[model samples]
Target chain A: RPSDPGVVSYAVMPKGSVSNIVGAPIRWESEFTAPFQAFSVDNPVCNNWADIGLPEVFNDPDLASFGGATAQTAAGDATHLVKQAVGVFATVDAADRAYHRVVDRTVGCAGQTTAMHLDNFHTEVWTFTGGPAGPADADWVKQEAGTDRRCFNTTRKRENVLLQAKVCQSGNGGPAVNVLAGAMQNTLGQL
Target chain B: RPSDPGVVSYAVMPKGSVSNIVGAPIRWESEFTAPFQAFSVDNPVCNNWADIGLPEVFNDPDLASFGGATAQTAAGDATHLVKQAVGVFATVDAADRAYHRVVDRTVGCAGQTTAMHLDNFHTEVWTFTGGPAGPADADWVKQEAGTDRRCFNTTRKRENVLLQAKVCQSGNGGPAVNVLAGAMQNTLGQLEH
Candidate 1:
């Protein structure tokens, strides 16, 4: 029943805030262009949400405004990439409902993988494990088969704004992702 | 079943290794003078072990060579303190037995406290919480009443050497202690032949 009225009316997250949330230098691949627009089918979580087009949760009538951001590390190979999507809804109940749906999908898609994709001659295969989920938050880890790289993903909702993040690294990225999630959640707390 | 023969005969830990384990500028209050000699009844875990004198675990006949080290942070108040004890037993079975006995004591004495101590005209009260314990390792947290400082304690056994540490900090020190434990464990891994 908690309501974060501060962000209920936000159309998009500020660039500085996103940068602060990242806490690293990155090239913005996508920046709050649209709701879920920053998400890539390349990642397992997004691929699960793909279903050929925009997800139904994003299309909910109670949804107000949404922003999605994607960032790539300075280096290309064996790098860390991140994507964060923020959504604000008209009511706390609507946001809560949307959050629960995502949680369900995350749980249902455990140990799932998408087909190999070859883009510009580069091949990729990814596998995901169902991470822990709480009332307002969820997190999981995904790995690329060929490169053996992993990404830690966290989905969290506070009040009426849903904040989701994907932090990919060449190695164990749990600690880094945990700090990031805590920081973003703290920022949401301020809101 | 893992045995670290590298430390089985070590009488005392090298000074450089203790500094590396601490990873800070510290004044050595006690340095492996003798078995459990560096331990103080001030900390709850030690106080729990403190049955008037040296603990029965240290007195076990299986204990071969023992070394204990204590370090204090550079600053005076709101500082961190550390204590490490290494015991090399005659055999792996004996070392395992000693580790489990300490584990039982740690569990049985959860939420326990020791009387306030007045040393050098300064007063101190300490309390401890039962932390997680594994087959060869255990850890817990302790807090000083007046200063509100906490310390994370870890006891681990590898091969024939029992490694125990108490890493105190001004605030939440779990992350730092976990890293230190990992580093020490990694060091122990190198001993594998």
Candidate 2:
């Protein structure tokens, strides 16, 4: 790790590394070749979390560097997709602060469709709970309106880095819990 | 009232009449000279409700016509502002449907700040309860973060019209409840023969 914050090269898991961690046949690829960088609250990129009913904090001053990758079962097919984002903060306390903010907002939004609009007409319902691991971990599920579309999101914190990952699938099937766990472990361990 | 739906000229309360109904010394003026028109759900104006933690319904197909006017204590000062909107639907049932939609959403949004955002840093806390008059009425209060800013909103339905009005004040002072009630009564009364 770099002595100072803002270096994301070592912290982000490569697409090739994801299959081993997830232990699945699904291939992963980069949404973008390089990571997206945001270092201040004023950045519009911070509002990316707003679509999911969470407040904007990606640009918080405490955030040092950020990276993300999105994958699907097949190219151009969004039926099954996975997204992983890692954020390195200025300190452990800063990372922990961001984690708790997610917890507080998730609790406030649970079972309420007021904030869950996917578009003008379609909305979603979200449910949350404590994760199986440590206090800094959380489990989230989002069910879209009028269909079987759903997403499972898990958040975990390690030292000064925060990991937020989700698996979204259309139609009913079991979510790959081990994939999420492995990815968390891989990303956290690498840092 | 018009023989058929889609005419808003007679339903909207005028700026000249606002101070009398509100019973306050504050002078009121039009945010716009002519009322806004929305008759279908696809209109972007429908989402005007989104900022306040409410879903967009201004463009529901059943809506026949809509009109609104906003006023503040002075021309540029928004510290004390009042807004009044009147929506006429195809039928009384359609109007009631719109009213219940607001109730369901208000209940779901009460006490939750996830949907509230005046800006990136500031959010709001909302509390809701039944209104004083009838079953089709609702009372809503929104408190902004880290300040004394607040808004009192009351929703009421009459026949084929749904009335939503609010009084927003910044700093410590009583909200002009009578003004809101008076606006509702005046607007509703003008629709009859």
Candidate 3:
């Protein structure tokens, strides 16, 4: 007899990184481990593929998550793979909010060129989340997808942390997320 | 003896015609016989020698026997010959009077051209009458002078004759002398004729 946990934890691939494990099972272990070691020597099933397929995987998730429901609806509503944790909420929207705050703060402080760079980054994340699948049964695709997902998440978290550090460092002591959150709230209200 | 005739009859030459005979003797018998003959005939004495000689013979008592002091004085005063006759008179003053009258009449009637003819006549008569030698030597002068005197008397008598002729003939009176004496007297006055 299988014991059923009340809350289930699933390892799912993000939208853009779907090309990494195209033929792989949707199980948490398969989705997570397939993208990570598919291009490596240790992985016997898939190896020695030239491209990491990071562009496909990263593009969908980057576009969908940061670009909101509008970008997600436009690119075909796709799903992300959940890994390790059970009952993984779709927290990409919240991450995007955090991302927007970091981006807006960076842009306001750093001027137009810096704003454009962050905007491109946001576009990439959206594309990875909601854009098309890249390659199937390719170890390079798996490897690139896994690495790109890690990179995007890391950048998002680092920007939020930097924002929090800035808020803490400033004498004003404002909320770290307030910059983009307030702007979006106001924009939505006006619309 | 010098004969004294109280009054005499003579002829006046036309004024300027007297110069035609100067320094010539009076020759009456020859001039009276041939009045119009040239003075230069037979001897070529003067051109108008007969005109010069005629007046002296007419005024000489030795020749005509008529007497008047005026004629004698005029005969004594004669110098040159006559060329044309102007008139006859009882006195030299009368002769001059008749001359000036005809001059004035011809002048008034026919303008300066006719006056010039009369003027030339008067001038010759005056010159002839006022010569040296008296009236004796110049016999042609005396005769020509007598012809001018007779012509003037005839002109005075024929005034009515000239007028009658002018009336009958018409057209500028066929020469100014053609007028009747009465008409000439009417136009030029009594003594003026």
Candidate 4:
């Protein structure tokens, strides 16, 4: 096993909702629809850790040991941490929901309203870092990030991203700083 | 009098709430804001007689009479006739009003809510005949018939005539036909407009 397990970023684009799944903040920067009009093979990939409360197991040193003597104390702290983080995420998700509602009333619905009626909608998510290294993993991350960059075609179409991620590095005992560095490289290598 | 009073047809574009004064049935063929903006010159024009609801006054034997004993009877008939014609015109006008209401809801309300606004909206009403001839003498039937062909240009771009007289000869009697024809013409003019 590698000394440094490194970090793996997960992104997921939920099927029936605008926001991403729990444990990930919606990555507006990495949001995009797939080409070919078909279901994305690498869909529902973990994207925004901020949107869905970040798991304390991934960051807190106390929660790192799964079965150590401090496991009980760490688990309790992790539970409280997740609860608080999820609470914050929920507020953001609620705001996003409200924004979409007003948008529908003013202009029109963002995407299809009928459940599972997939006409012109397709989303994708990918692991940006720390997963099994493979050609497929590299391809998946490239496509996900590329799709987000080229959301709109040249016909003056408006590209609407369902979710986005703001990757940040938490400094020594303080709030996470918005660093542009990403984890796709390490995640691709792991895969 | 002038040997043959020259019938000069002048088409002037109407503007603002004036369509109501002209009493002309606003047609679909009329041009709106071209070469002219809203409230600009060349908005659209409505004919005097058409606007007033006596389009037949320029032609119909029983309807046309300049003066004298016949004029008296014609004027008497006109009192009821004009009102009756106006009533029919009013129904078409109502539809136009409804359309404007929809436009206002979708777009925005500015001016000219009804056809009657065409009255003051005078672009020159082009006369096909009877100008120096002095307003069509009581006995002149030919001139009356010819006047029905007249039309007026509403747009400053000269793109279209907002109103055109639909020729109605003898034996064409249904009230519905007149109403539909007027509406149809109005519809076309609006499209043109």
Candidate 5:
């Protein structure tokens, strides 16, 4: 890991070196495995987890299955600007559970709809409408779906980690924001 | 279906049945079929479509949905650039196939919340950020989801029609608006089921 954490090359880029994923400074193997980069040249930049909003939650310790940490921020400025942070987690199940927790708060708050991130490993979203931002808020939106990165070798050990991302824009729905969110999720999956 | 539209007996209401569903509808099944009253004596009211912000959209003829519509203006006394309308639609399906489409244009314009109706019905949202309102500015999010209610049912029996209603406050993202939105949806289901 870089000395400070503004941005760095991904540790799992080439596939063979992916095993070294657990070696990163973050205790959780599922959080950030590769370069912490932006989804696009103009999208939000990924910074050190400590520097992002509500930084400490990245590793709640309470939920250690997602036992490693290292996260990035991805934001955008389109018709609707979206600023979201994608925090990496340790396992798929932990990710799945976390996502539902957000839904229970948001959708149940008022017969709302949870029609996002449906196919793949598992992704959860905490849409911060208020508070300093992060899990402490009462209603954070969680999306449970397949992960972007998949383990190709059935015989080898793998990282079935999850990405806990958060969206903040006051209003919870925006097409442009959705794209920005998707871009970040897609980038992590490609690795 | 009233002659003028500012407030009527909710042609769908027994006309005299509702006693603040306008508790606070001047027709509260269009709003919800729910306790048929209020959680208290002062809940959200379903007033005349005309008194509401965008009265033209009612009947839409195309979106026979909300076949029952009583518009009421629920604006803010605070500082917020919002001119949203709360229009109710008749259900197109019984599974209660719709949701509140909070356009939150002002919240979205240079900024964001986009909670809206889901499917199989007609939903027209008006999110006015600035100026004289109605779709003519930047960040005016007007999304018409799915097929309109052009396929009228009177010719035969109608599928279960659920009314979709919404309440809006200009400031955006405040707890008040969230409560209003929830009250509308929660009330609808409570009455229908």
Candidate 6:
């Protein structure tokens, strides 16, 4: 089985060297980056090995509803960087349940919204608040004042992959990021 | 039969709200955008509905290869928009095409080079400098530089709709144009819905 071509097709990130937007490359500094993090093909292809109080920044419950996803994801910061992490994502929604999940959380839930379009794929950016090593009181609650962040998500149905490419630029650079993500998907270049 | 759910699925552009990028909304704009023209789609969906100068501005040969494409492609210029329409096109090679035809042109062999992605969709814009507009040339050499505009074309495969999209802001708005286009797609608003 190890010698079969089918076995290799299951690897994360394609077989080629990685290339992202002309500027933003991997942080190399993030613990989850290449050579240190997980890149599995079977069950639990990606989960929080770091065991953070929340979820593994990239692959969390919000992402699992998509489809049969084996991920090629990441996290970073840069002038070249748009978010701490983004990927071709085990990007899936074969059933489109994930699309509905997104509509529920952002569009219908009324989070601050923004988006971008490229060819047939359209990206939507939604934002929500967080609790920074803090606590909650009454209806108003408490956490890190700056804990609020944006979730930049672009979901497209490519053949079978409901690929979701995303980045969180602190409610900024939403469309630009989608453009490059669109470049990754619709272009010959690898992401 | 007509009341069947399957019949509706076959109608092109889902039955919900119609949202696509704005400035580049209609594919005809990519072509007529320079001389000024029109774009329309029917379920007899998205074929041609006009006659301008250089092939109606949208949906010509470069697009037919994708799936069942009923395109809505474009081209543009924001002062930064690139292309008098040139390049190898990042448009998808989704399905291997039988490309004996494109070999009939400048960038061909398989014609699959025609595609649409999110970011980079290049296109070529044109202008005539002869006739009453001008005169004749060395049989044809002068038509190149006179091609004053750029059209970025992206032909893509969505489900099975081989859709095309473009923008030309000099005829364009470049990035800001795409942003507006993006806004239309991500919202409940309507352009043609």
Interface RMSD values for the candidates, listed in order?
20.2, 22.6, 89.0, 40.5, 21.7, 18.1
Ranking by TM-score: 1, 2, 6, 5, 4, 3
What digit string (tens of lDDT, one per residue) describes model 2 on residues B1-193? Answer: 4224443465445554544333232465574322343222222322223222132534577777776677765776665566767777788888788777666544444443333334335534433323333577766655555555666676767777777776665421122433455545554543666
lDDT of 1 by residue, A65-146 (tens): 4545556654452265766566555567777887777776555566777654544555556676865579997777777877
Lowest-lDDT window of 10 residues in candidate 5 chain B? Answer: B148-157
Local lDDT at B45 for model 1: 53
Q: Taking the true A–B contacts (Cα pairs closer than 8 Å), what share appears in each candidate?
A: 0.00, 0.00, 0.00, 0.00, 0.00, 0.00
Model-by-model DockQ, in order: 0.02, 0.01, 0.00, 0.00, 0.01, 0.01
- lDDT string for model 4 (A119-177, tens) is 35744432232223221111111112323311110000001111112222121101111
TM-score of each: 0.42, 0.38, 0.13, 0.14, 0.20, 0.23
lDDT of each: 0.56, 0.52, 0.20, 0.19, 0.24, 0.24
lDDT of 5 at A140: 30
Q: Whose DockQ is higher: candidate 1's or candidate 3's?
A: 1
Better by TM-score, candidate 3 or 2 = 2
Candidate 1 lDDT by residue in tens digits, B1-193: 4434454234233334433343333444556535543244544554533321134555578777666655564436225466666666778888788777677755645676665454455555567676557888777766777664667677777776676766665434443445455555554443556
Q: What order do you get sorting by lDDT, best first?
A: 1, 2, 6, 5, 3, 4
User: What ranges in model 3 sit over 4 Å off?
Assistant: A1-191, B1-6, B9-21, B24-97, B108-193
Residue-level lDDT of model 3, residues A86-165, one tens digit each, is 11112334334433432332222211111111222331111111112122110011212212321011121221011111
Question: For model 2, how does the per-residue alpha-carbon lDDT over A64-175 read when each residue is reduced to its tens digit?
Answer: 4455667666676756666766666656777788777666544444443333344445434433323333577776566665667767776676777676776677652224
Chain A TM-scores, candidates in order: 0.71, 0.66, 0.16, 0.16, 0.32, 0.36
Question: For model 5 chain A, where is the 10-residue window of minimal lDDT?
Answer: A149-158
- Tell me the deviation in Å of residue B119 in model 5: 67
Poorly placed runs, candidate 4 (over 4 Å): A1-146, A149-191, B1-193
> Which scores better on TM-score, 1 or 5?
1
By DockQ: ranked, best first: 1, 6, 5, 2, 4, 3
